[PDB]
Every structure is written in structure tokens, then in C-alpha cells.
Design a protein around this ligand. Structure first.
Ligand SMILES: O=C(O)c1ccccc1Nc1ccc(OCCCP(=O)(O)O)cc1C(=O)O
Ligand SMILES: O=C(O)c1ccccc1Nc1ccc(OCCCP(=O)(O)O)cc1C(=O)O
Lengths: 331, 336
């Protein structure tokens, strides 16, 4: 019951097995008042959620969500996304796909806004996302379309404004269920929890947190990486200087509205050089490294990832892929 | 100031700045707060661990919006007798006994949506839903009055609703006893939550009230006879933590089970009728506590002598039949 679960949380106790799932299921079946949703969200956040608990929450969401048709998602598909740099992750995603690694993203409007500004059709049913993945090499699951039952939880989150445990679930509830990815987490304390959740489902993932606060591999300083592979977690410090990347300023990597990001995307994929390109290349490589961690060395993998990412841009393959992505939505 | 700012601060486990709790409660009471914001605020403040300043701001806002009793109609030395709950039988009986001893009593409560304070009184034939003028007259003519919460705190209705929806106790559970609209300066105030009792006492202290905030070490929001009780003695803006043992005053230990509105009424009639037992003892104990608190208003009398006088007065109020008569007169007053 709610008094039971909420009571347990306000007493600063971890939940028993299944309780978080029950709570989430009530929320997802419209059997939860806004006050109950809000109380749970806040309490779960201030207690400090466990990997088990967050896993149960994402599990329920995925159990209710629209799936992609059987055998439409390649076994080695990847995600590139952050909890919240949507400009960097959107560009990295295009680059990774152009390098030949299938990419299936999942998001909402406020990084879907940027893709729409670029002329991409973001709101597609499972059948067409599958077609997009196969034919273009990339797909996007529009969260409101795939998680309609979450709308009540979505409204509460906007009403209270502040971040909660629910801010962690985006990368964990991709309806296409990619087994790999580059996952940004702005909250250092929670990044290890997310990595724990990915470890549980045996994903090959790099959970990343810039030491400057970015939910992305940064170039202004070092980054912390929770490398998830073989169901286990390794925590590393990462410095892109080891790969010849010059230090940049934080203000140089920041995003703007959909139109500004769209302009930045066209610039980078058009061959523009500077710190924005560098960050994109770096994060694209990270996703490729995660992809490699599925079927099997750290530095050689990175060096190869950086080559493939840079080439995907310089050959124009990334720019072409975007053009083909746009053209797909019209055909 | 905003909900994101305030809720963000609380979730970061920081105390609020001066005025923020007040701003939040004001929003809640002027209908400018979403149920989700209300619930988030109540839960977040609870898990952060509320301060006396913060709870004081909440109660302060509520009282600033409340309907007052008319000028010069509440005696200087009026007292409250109540618990946070979450012992209505005991506090109701204790209140009648205290009033019959000659200490003006003004209570504050609401009907229960499951049982509560007003329900016991209704079952006894008391008219609970009176306006300020009639509560004032009740207090003057009968020696006791009851402020029906919905009537005096109308703007609080949205907050009260959210309380029930989330179920679990929050800091909001402290506000009832802290927002008696007659603003009595003394009382016996029970708190079921041992952690928040000290906070309550701090709020009363800031007001320079003379109160015993009480928590039975068996969990009762009332002075118990089953074991010891923790009392936060509030007087002269100072809080003093004490442990109270009824055995020190000759009370035999009782079991918890020995302590429904129709059933509460029967228990009230029995005790006021002279029936001996653990229930009477508990009533006499808490009545005496209210009387000790009352004494702390004007005199700096010692702990022991004050209690012994309190116990004598409570017992006499029952044994002379004064308590029984006062209830009857209370019932007749409403029917007039
Ligand atoms: O807004 C609505 O009432 C609604 C109506 C139809 C379909 C979806 C609707 N809202 C949503 C449903 C799911 C959802 O889940 C998206 C997950 C949020 P996150 O990006 O993972 O953090 C978000 C919304 C929304 O209103 O934004
Ligand atoms: O229930 C509480 O937590 C509470 C605490 C302190 C004071 C009053 C409290 N309750 C209420 C206050 C106002 C109210 O308003 C009800 C509607 C009043 P009106 O019809 O507009 O005049 C209802 C309650 C309640 O307990 O349900």
C-alpha cells in the first residue's frame, strides 16, 4: 500500500523486493493520485534510491511500453543520451550511426526538438522506427508515443519542477532496449546507481559524468566513467588529453534553442572544426567503445573509435546519413 | 521565491531561509498550490527534519489567515488539552475535568473520516460547529469551548485534503495543536512522534507559551500509565526535557489495551460518573498535566508541588461531580 511504502521511505529504509515495482505500476495504471505520485517521487529521491529499486521502476515502465516488432532491433544497437548537452549527444548519435553502428534513441520535447528543427520525423510508431533503423541506420522512439501511461507521472514532475529519481529513468526505459550505449549522468552520486541498473541487465555501457558537471564526456577537464561490461562495474578517471584533445571552455560546449542546435549540427557535420566537433568525436567514440564491449582492449578500442568517428564526419557519411534520415520521413 | 527553489532546497537536505516556509504555506492557503506541490513540500520538509523556526512559520501563516475569537473573549489563562494523534477519549475527558477545576479550556479539532475529537463530543450531545461569538460565550458561560477546525481555518482545506490522500504522517500532523484559533497560552499537548515533539516544544517556546509537550514512551500522544513518558516542559521561552513516571505519584502500571465515538462517549460518561480504573487514572494524569501547565503561566512553582496540587484538583473535579455537571451544562448550552 501507499501508506506502507511511503512510510518505509520516510523512515529512510530501502524498500522490500517488489515494492518499488508495485508503486510504479500503480502510477502507470492511473491508480495513483497526484499527491501520491509526488510523495513517492520526493521520498524515493531523499531516501537515496538503490540500483534494485530503480531497476524495478524502469522494469515496470518497459513492461507497459510499446515494444518494437520481434527481430527489428539489431543485437548490437546502441543508445547515446544523457539524464540532463542535447546538441552533443544528438550529433554523436548521427556520427555513430554513420560509422555503421545501429543507433536507437529515445526522448521527449523540452533533444527531439533539435531533430525536428533538422526536419526529422521524431514521432513514429514501432513499425516505422524499425524501418528507420534498418533503412537509415538510426531510429528515434518518441517517449509520449511509447509510454502513454506515464503521462500522469509526467504532469506531476513538471508541477514540482525539481529533479527526482524519475530523472534517471529515460536512459533506462528505451523501448527498443538497446544492449549498449554511452549514457550521461549529471548527478555523480546517482551515476553509479544507473551503472548498477545497466550491469543487472548485462548491458555494455559507459556511464559518464564530466568532472565539470556535464552529462557527457567533456573536453574542459577529466571525466568519471563507470564502465559496465560482463555484468560488472569498473570506475575510471578519463582524460581526453591522452588522445591529443586540447582543453576547451565550458561556455563553448553549451546549447541553445532548437534552431541554434540545428545550426551547430549542420556546422559540425559540415566539417567545422573546434571544441564542439571534438566533444562530438569524443562521445561518438565512447559509444563505439561501448558497442565493442558487447562482443569482447580499452586504449586500442578508443583509438579505433576515434578514427571511425572522425572519418564518419570527414567523409561526409554523417551529413549524408542525416539527409537520408530526413528523406526517410518524407517517403 | 518559488516551489522549484524551495523544494530543491529541501531535497538537498538544507534548512530553508527565513520566510520560505511562510511563503510556501501562504501559497498553499491562497489556493495557489498544486496538490503535487503540497505533497512534495510536506514530505520533503519531514524527511529533511523540520526546524522549530520552519514549523513556526507554517503555524504563523495559518493563524494569520484564521478567523479570530472576538476581542477580550478568551481568558488570559485559557488552556488546550489535545494530542497530535496518529487518545481522543483521554484528552476529551481530561479537557472536561480541567474546565471543571476552574481552568478555562478551549479546544480545537475536526471530525474524523474513519473517531476524532469532534465526533466524541457530538456523540455526547455537544454542539461542535459554532462560530467565534458562540465559542466565546460557551467559554464564558460553561467554562469550555470547542473550535471546529473547518470553520476557523477555511483556507487550509486544500492542504488538509492532501494530508489524507498521501496517508503517511508528515510535519503537517503537528499543525493542528499549534494553530488553535483561540490562541490559548498554555496546555497539555501530546505528540505521537518522539522526534517532532522537541520541535513542537520549540515552537511553543518561541511564543512564550506554558506547555507540557508529552510523549508516552509506549508511543501514546498522551501521558500514559503503562510506563514512563517524556515531557518537554516549556516555560519562559525555555524547553526542559524530563522523564515522567506515574508510579512516583502512586499510579499502578496498566496495559496498553486497557486504554469509536459511541464507545468513547460511554467511556466519558463512565469515568465522569466515578468509575475507577486505568482510564480514570490516565484522565486524572493528563488533566493534572494541563493544570501544571496552567500554573506555569503566572507562578514559577516547583514541579512536584504543582503536580500534587494538579492531581488533587483533577480528582476532586471528578469526585465532587463537577466534571459530570459541566458536561451536562455544556450539552444544555448548545441546545439553548
Ligand atoms: O501530456 C499528456 O497528457 C500526454 C498525452 C498523450 C500521450 C502522452 C502524454 N504525456 C507524456 C507521456 C509520457 C511521457 O514520458 C516521457 C518520459 C519522460 P523522460 O524524458 O524519460 O524523463 C511524457 C509525457 C509528457 O507529457 O511529456
Ligand atoms: O486537517 C488538518 O490537518 C487541519 C489542521 C489544522 C487546522 C485545520 C485542519 N483541517 C481542515 C481545515 C479546513 C478545512 O476546510 C473545509 C472546508 C471549509 P469551508 O466549507 O470552505 O467553509 C478542512 C479541514 C479538514 O480537516 O478536513
Amino acid at each position: 500500500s501507499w501508506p506502507q511504502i511511503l512510510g518505509r521511505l520516510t523512515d529512510n529504509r530501502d524498500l522490500a523486493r517488489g515494492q518499488a515495482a508495485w508503486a510504479m505500476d500503480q502510477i502507470m495504471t492511473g491508480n495513483a493520485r497526484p499527491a501520491q505520485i509526488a510523495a513517492f517521487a520526493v521520498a524515493m529521491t531523499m531516501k537515496a534510491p538503490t540500483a534494485d529499486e530503480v531497476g524495478e521502476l524502469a522494469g515496470v515502465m518497459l513492461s507497459h511500453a510499446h515494444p518494437l516488432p520481434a527481430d527489428t532491433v539489431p543485437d548490437d544497437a546502441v543508445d547515446v543520451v544523457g539524464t540532463g548537452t542535447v546538441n552533443l549527444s544528438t550529433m554523436a548519435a548521427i556520427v555513430v550511426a554513420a560509422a555503421g553502428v545501429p543507433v536507437v534513441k529515445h526522448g521527449n520535447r523540452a533533444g527531439a526538438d533539435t531533430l525536428e528543427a533538422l526536419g526529422v520525423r521524431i514521432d513514429l510508431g514501432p513499425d516505422l522506427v524499425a524501418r528507420s533503423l534498418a533503412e537509415v541506420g538510426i531510429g528515434f522512439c518518441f517517449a509520449p508515443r511509447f509510454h502513454p501511461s506515464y503521462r500522469h507521472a509526467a504532469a506531476v514532475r513538471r508541477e514540482i519542477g525539481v529533479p527526482t529519481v524519475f530523472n534517471l529513468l529515460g536512459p533506462l526505459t528505451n523501448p527498443a532496449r538497446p544492449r549498449a550505449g554511452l549514457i550521461g549522468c549529471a548527478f555523480a552520486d546517482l551515476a553509479e546507481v544507473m551503472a548498477g541498473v545497466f550491469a543487472a541487465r548485462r548491458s555494455s555501457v559507459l556511464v559518464v559524468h564530466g568532472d565539470d558537471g556535464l552529462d557527457e564526456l567533456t573536453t574542459t577537464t577529466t571525466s568519471t566513467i563507470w564502465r559496465v561490461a560482463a555484468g560488472s562495474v569498473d570506475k575510471l578517471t578519463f582524460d581526453p588529453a591522452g588522445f591529443g584533445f586540447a582543453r576547451a571552455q565550458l561556455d563553448q560546449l553549451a546549447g541553445g534553442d532548437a534552431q541554434a542546435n540545428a545550426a551547430a549540427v549542420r556546422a559540425v557535420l559540415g566539417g567545422a572544426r573546434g571544441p564542439v566537433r571534438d566533444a562530438v568525436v569524443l562521445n561518438a567514440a565512447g559509444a563505439i567503445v561501448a558497442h565493442a564491449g558487447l562482443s569482447s582492449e580499452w586504449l586500442p578500442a578508443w583509438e579505433e573509435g576515434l578514427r571511425r568517428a572522425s572519418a564518419a564526419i570527414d567523409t561526409g557519411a554523417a551529413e549524408q546519413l542525416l539527409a537520408r534520415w530526413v528523406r526517410f520521413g518524407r517517403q
